[PDB]
Amino acid sequence: VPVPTGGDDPTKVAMLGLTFDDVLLLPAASDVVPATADTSSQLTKRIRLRVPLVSSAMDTVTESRMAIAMARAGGMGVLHRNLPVAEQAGQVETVKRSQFPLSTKDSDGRLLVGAAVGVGDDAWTRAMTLVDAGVDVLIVDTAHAHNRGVLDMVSRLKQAVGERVDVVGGNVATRAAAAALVEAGADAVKVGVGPGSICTTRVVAGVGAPQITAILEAVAACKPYGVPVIADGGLQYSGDIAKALAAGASTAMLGSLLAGTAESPGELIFVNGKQFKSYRGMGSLGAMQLVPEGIEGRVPFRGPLGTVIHQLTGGLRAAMGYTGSATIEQLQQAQFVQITAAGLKESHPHDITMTVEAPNYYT
Amino acid sequence: VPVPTGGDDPTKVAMLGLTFDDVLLLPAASDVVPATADTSSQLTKRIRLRVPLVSSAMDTVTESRMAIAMARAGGMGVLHRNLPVAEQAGQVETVKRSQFPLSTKDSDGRLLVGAAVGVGDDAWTRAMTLVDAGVDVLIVDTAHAHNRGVLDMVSRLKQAVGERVDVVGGNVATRAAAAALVEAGADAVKVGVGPGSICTTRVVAGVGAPQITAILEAVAACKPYGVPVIADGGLQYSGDIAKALAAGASTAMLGSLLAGTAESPGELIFVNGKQFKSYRGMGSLGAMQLVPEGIEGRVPFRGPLGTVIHQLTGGLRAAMGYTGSATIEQLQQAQFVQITAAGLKESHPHDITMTVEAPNYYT
Amino acid sequence: VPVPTGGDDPTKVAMLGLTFDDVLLLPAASDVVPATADTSSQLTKRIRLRVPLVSSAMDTVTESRMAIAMARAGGMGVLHRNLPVAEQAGQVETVKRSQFPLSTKDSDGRLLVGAAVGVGDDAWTRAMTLVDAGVDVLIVDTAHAHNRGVLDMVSRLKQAVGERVDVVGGNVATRAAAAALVEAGADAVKVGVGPGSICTTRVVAGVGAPQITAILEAVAACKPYGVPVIADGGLQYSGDIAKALAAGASTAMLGSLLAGTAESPGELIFVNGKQFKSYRGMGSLGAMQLVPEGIEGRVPFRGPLGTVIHQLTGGLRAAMGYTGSATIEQLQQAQFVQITAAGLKESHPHDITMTVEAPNYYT
Amino acid sequence: VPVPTGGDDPTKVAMLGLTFDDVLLLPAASDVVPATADTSSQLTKRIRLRVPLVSSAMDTVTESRMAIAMARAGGMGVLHRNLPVAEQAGQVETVKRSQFPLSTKDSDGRLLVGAAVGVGDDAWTRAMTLVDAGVDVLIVDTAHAHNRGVLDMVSRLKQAVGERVDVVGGNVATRAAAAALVEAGADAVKVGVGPGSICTTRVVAGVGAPQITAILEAVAACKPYGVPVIADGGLQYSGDIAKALAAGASTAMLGSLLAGTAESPGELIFVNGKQFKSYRGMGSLGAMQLVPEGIEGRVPFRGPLGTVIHQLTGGLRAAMGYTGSATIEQLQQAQFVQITAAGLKESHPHDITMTVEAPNYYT
Amino acid sequence: AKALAAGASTAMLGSLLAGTAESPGELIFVNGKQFKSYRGMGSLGAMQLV
Ligand SMILES: NC(=O)c1ccc[n+]([C@@H]2O[C@H](COP(=O)([O-])OP(=O)(O)OC[C@H]3O[C@@H](n4cnc5c(N)ncnc54)[C@H](O)[C@@H]3O)[C@@H](O)[C@H]2O)c1
Ligand SMILES: NC(=O)c1ccc[n+]([C@@H]2O[C@H](COP(=O)([O-])OP(=O)(O)OC[C@H]3O[C@@H](n4cnc5c(N)ncnc54)[C@H](O)[C@@H]3O)[C@@H](O)[C@H]2O)c1
Ligand SMILES: NC(=O)c1ccc[n+]([C@@H]2O[C@H](COP(=O)([O-])OP(=O)(O)OC[C@H]3O[C@@H](n4cnc5c(N)ncnc54)[C@H](O)[C@@H]3O)[C@@H](O)[C@H]2O)c1
Ligand SMILES: NC(=O)c1ccc[n+]([C@@H]2O[C@H](COP(=O)([O-])OP(=O)(O)OC[C@H]3O[C@@H](n4cnc5c(N)ncnc54)[C@H](O)[C@@H]3O)[C@@H](O)[C@H]2O)c1
Ligand SMILES: *c1nc2c(ncn2[C@@H]2O[C@H](COP(=O)(O)O)[C@@H](O)[C@H]2O)c(=O)[nH]1
Ligand SMILES: *c1nc2c(ncn2[C@@H]2O[C@H](COP(=O)(O)O)[C@@H](O)[C@H]2O)c(=O)[nH]1
Ligand SMILES: *c1nc2c(ncn2[C@@H]2O[C@H](COP(=O)(O)O)[C@@H](O)[C@H]2O)c(=O)[nH]1
Ligand SMILES: *c1nc2c(ncn2[C@@H]2O[C@H](COP(=O)(O)O)[C@@H](O)[C@H]2O)c(=O)[nH]1
Ligand SMILES: *c1nc2c(ncn2[C@@H]2O[C@H](COP(=O)(O)O)[C@@H](O)[C@H]2O)c(=O)[nH]1
Ligand SMILES: [K+]
Ligand SMILES: [K+]
Ligand SMILES: [K+]
Ligand SMILES: [K+]
16 A cells, blocks of 8 residues: 555655666667767757867866867867956956867857856846857856746846847756746756765755756756757766767766866866865855855866867767767667666776776776 | 565565665755745644754763753753653753743743653653653653553653643654554654664664655654654754655754764763764663663764754755745655665765865765 | 566566565564563474574584583584594584573483484485484585485485484575475475575575575475474574564574684684684585685684573564564564665664674674 | 656666676576586587687787687687787697697597687788688677678678688677677677676776676577577676576686686786786777777786686586586576675675685685 | 995996886886886896705
């Protein structure tokens, strides 16, 4: 009579959530060489990137230098909103005023750049100043996009400057929230609540949703209207990028994987003869200066951004070759297999003493 | 033909139990700002607390100082019964005889306090002495409330001093035990058998049930009759408190989270330059002086109790904002998602060298 | 179309096996005091023990001293068969020739004792010599009792000396093997293939079954005919003994839990100031002097056997009080709840630095 | 309404994949002595090995010495293709031109040997040169055999040199891929995509399938046509070999298990007084000289090959005795039990300080 | 400097040069760090004893 997990309501525990480590991509019939695969994808309904990667809007990840490097690499960067409005507009102008076949450019031939804003009248003034500076895409960047205020802000921005710039809606984790964002007029939906490597929301508040299931649910609401999905947070390997794209996301937003590059803001730190640099959540105590939802830490230095992007894109191309996907649209139709805890350790290198770190696999 | 787990009886392995680490709260459409969320909840059918947290009845957790501080913070404290009867009555008198808007006070304006009693005639004398000293709530505090003697004691206490004080029934882990306590006349039901951080009941005896499933099962029996549920044991984060309340519990009883504060009894101990203090189970060999069901240990010093309570309440408010719950009664209607082991390590911070501890998240 | 785990045969992966760590005992309505519980149980169809515990027939576990101590404590010991026939008969006579209210005795007032034999004509000579020496129960002690030769040996022993002594069949792991042993005429069935703490069978050969499922399957075949079941191996806590009895077994056989006592054969060893003593499988290379199926190691010294037995019986009595079982026969009807990996770490003590080892819970 | 793992497509997450650590073999009625079990099995449709073990085609595993030793031990070796064509043909000639009752030989009495080729016209020239030298079997050795080019190469090789040599098809993980290889004319199918100990494909690309499920799926397509299956990668114990053969595979290909033997190519390395030797994947950066799909490492020294082969065969014989299988074909009809994470640690030695390593179990 | 100040005219170097790229022998990886072999000429391996 009772539900097998307790109680009498079968909907109290709605579903079993899967994350990146729970699934593997199944190989399929292939006619695709990894070098010949096309990795272009839609960032928004009007913007297409050669490489479907976007830099996170964090004060230890993206400033003008990172945005320029990401745009030249074939992606795009999103400037963080921790600095004043005038400084953010200056960074936008620095990017717009700025070897690279894949570089993403607008109609005037200048590099594309995105900028993050919050909610409120101060956020409205920031958004208007950024728009007048020549921004290409505004990110309503919150922790909970299903709030009434976030939806109202997206609606207002679409009404005011929808012709000039694209508007992306903040993080959701359910089908209903994505549907609400689509109804509000968002040109793209960002997915993920709590999976970030520096996030403590799922511990502090106990609220979250595993990223693969969240992407599936959000795509189920966004695809019929042609609204692209950006998987944000929790990606540690190029295989995770491939899994995120196969689940239905159109682009991926990278955090820790880029915080260690030379183009990220911040100096270099030496610890026991090894190089690191600072990486902190935007809900951390230091960043928000309270109940923090992030931590402070450091990540190992990786070097130039181009090399990291090349490794990630090579992994994605290998995945596309394995699944037989000529385009990202075809990759979005691939199938998964669910694995157990033993399958995960089988997947990684095992019963071996690794003698040297590979370029795409770190200890 | 047979049961997939073995045998021919399908009810031999009745159900699959979930605990806090197995679930996450799902975000929902929200109009709630965390600072405006109302955290008040029923402790019993007659007592409403501003902060839904109660201190455990342990000789290393709650005495007069801890009870006074908890009452001032908006919760309540339960005085342990390891000391003689006269001293317990004296501690009740000290608390009653004793800046703090949230402070919980009875009709006379004195701070609320609770006291734990056992089962037997000596426990009856203790209960009468505590009632004569002005206690507001008695906890029949046993490891197994489904025993006939515990139900008899609850019925006797309700018959004798029902009009004067509230009677809370000891720990259960099933629907049937909760129903039996409700029929016996309990004003509140305490849930949890073996989840405590210092318990060895589930190892020494092999008896228990996971906390989320136990709360769901007990709520299924208590909610139709209006009897509140207290989730006792196994809580290490504010997110766990939010999960427990969302599972149908009305209040949470805290152990180790408060044992390291300055208001808990005991002297401060230095180990390798760090500060700790003692924390032991009431079924430990030291506390019960045999077949013990608890251990002795120590927990790090955490400072004043008010800051800890504020961090816990901030996490709870964040959860209420995420789920769109203006009240605790609305939070009790939120939905869960079940996660795997990989989802558990995705929820916590990962692939990062934390450089300093967060106020609400400890290494 | 295909089976969810692969292939087209739904019987290829027959069932999901549970071990001790996968389940917990559900509390039930109780009128039982742990001190008043009755722990007597059948070892065979003719022999009843006051304490349902038996010592393993291993050369680092049971000889004359251990057998005498176990018999005085209320259980029984099984003499190992590594020594020559004459020495085993001498040990049997030493036990029979040998403060202890629970002592298990025959009709003549002498202590009960069991002896292990193998398969073959040499085993027949050993068995006849042991029967002539006054042994009470013979254990056909093999790794695979479903072999034709083991069943033939059991039938021969029952035909020849069935009236004088009881015959116990070696280790099975499935319902069919237990049914075959019952058909052969065994007075008791020993259950467990690979769960021993010193066994490598499930790694070397990949063959075994989780112990709880194996016990349930064996009981489903043995209980209708009134044939007792002995859970052998894998027991590390008293709660595991309670689980094994609740799953339907009538007795439990202990290995490592008794190897560290003073009555076990072997001297005392010092490593880094701590005391240990040797413990090896009978299929280990050292013992069988090849393809070994066991390892050699050492276990910490625990002191006299009586204290260990008292702790185990106290744990069992606590579990009986929790389940409301007046007798072992009633404990055999208790219900389980299945728990996940998170529930298992909730069940043990957590988030605490233990200051001293408990008498029934070790670091 | 939705799929419990997310979305609306029930085939998005096709199945649950099992690996070796997820299953155990069930004991069955037996009349088999391990010393009398027959381990002969089909490698291809025309080649029968006395020991169903083949050495991996890796530059740290198999050269002339290893191939000769494997042929003498009753199996076969596959010469790697990292060296130039002339050198590989010279190795083949060395092996052919070369006490041992189980040695596998052709009609002329010379030792059997196999060689690996890639895809393309250069691989075509290599294959013709190897066939001219007298190789017994060609392995189309790729990471993705469901590619169109691999199938075309298999078809061409069968059309050209079909009557002289047998052609084995590269690694698959799905029923459809095995069916395509069968249609193309393969004489045996090699199964496994990413389970190898030195593979990072499941991390770099996120693509693979757990090995037991993959073997079951491939056997479902290969058994009706009498095409043998070779399980390749992820084997660490002899029990894994038994499980793989029971899943339906006819032979097993071994990597790391043989990389530490005297006959493998490479010198011996000393680290902290212990002996190791190099072991690297063929997709490693060092071996392929780029986006690598393997790592470099080293494995402990194990001694002569014959002892290792004997221990593995002894474990297999023990498994065949447990399951009552006189032949490998009977072992292919055995049954599994699925186990959890707790069952996995029950299977291994536990709660013991292993003092000396066993010949078949290493710490 | 100390050796020269004590009166010696030149210094002969061993381990200080054994780790350079111009020294004979291949490179070895251990725990992510690079090393290379260095043995005395009276070592058992070199002289192939006491
Ligand atoms: N078993 C594995 O999972 C695995 C993975 C990587 C490498 N390897 C080993 O590395 C060696 C070289 O393998 P290789 O195949 O990379 O060599 P390769 O570069 O010679 O590839 C041979 C053919 O395999 C196919 N192929 C390989 N990877 C593909 C992909 N991602 N997408 C589409 N087609 C693909 C292509 O048709 C290619 O022409 C072999 O010894 C192989 O066993 C094995
Ligand atoms: N993705 C995540 O899970 C996550 C979590 C924490 C912080 N962050 C990052 O930190 C920065 C600040 O985030 P922020 O949203 O707290 O900034 P903020 O304080 O500017 O909040 C913006 C709006 O988000 C909504 N909101 C946020 N948390 C809410 C909650 N718990 N309940 C109800 N409404 C809530 C409110 O409408 C609020 O006005 C951003 O850059 C964001 O990406 C992200
Ligand atoms: N919540 C838990 O899981 C847990 C477990 C062990 C101990 N404790 C704490 O230890 C203290 C003492 O508890 P206690 O109950 O052991 O004290 P106690 O010895 O005073 O027992 C009180 C009554 O509880 C019942 N009872 C307790 N354990 C039982 C069992 N195993 N079987 C049957 N009836 C049983 C009996 O009726 C007994 O008279 C309390 O403060 C309690 O909270 C709690
Ligand atoms: N319970 C276990 O899982 C386990 C495992 C290994 C060893 N042991 C212990 O080791 C000792 C010797 O055990 P043993 O059985 O190896 O002794 P043994 O060599 O005397 O075998 C006795 C009989 O068991 C049967 N048998 C055992 N292993 C078999 C196999 N792999 N295939 C087919 N039949 C098999 C045969 O009929 C054999 O004649 C005993 O004390 C036993 O309890 C126990
Ligand atoms: C939680 N999440 C946070 C916080 N600041 C940013 N974020 C989110 O995490 C993403 C990065 O995750 P990685 O796994 O490191 O890639 C960001 O893009 C953002 O969405 C925070 O304080 N808490
Ligand atoms: C088991 N449980 C015990 C014992 N004494 C008290 N308790 C229970 O644990 C709760 C505390 O749990 P924490 O996880 O520490 O917060 C107490 O409130 C009580 O219910 C004991 O000896 N064994
Ligand atoms: C596997 N099992 C073995 C071996 N010798 C004995 N045994 C079995 O183990 C039991 C003891 O296990 P504990 O977990 O220590 O209680 C014995 O009673 C016997 O059945 C061996 O070599 N391999
Ligand atoms: C992944 N797999 C690779 C690579 N080179 C070879 N292999 C495969 O691994 C098998 C050996 O696995 P073990 O677990 O070590 O036995 C080989 O037979 C081959 O199929 C590589 O770079 N990545
Ligand atoms: C002792 N001395 C040895 C050996 N082989 C060479 N040598 C001497 O050591 C010098 C190098 O010393 P470093 O401190 O390493 O610079 C050489 O120049 C030679 O004189 C030997 O086996 N034992
Ligand atoms: K791997
Ligand atoms: K996280
Ligand atoms: K516990
Ligand atoms: K074992």
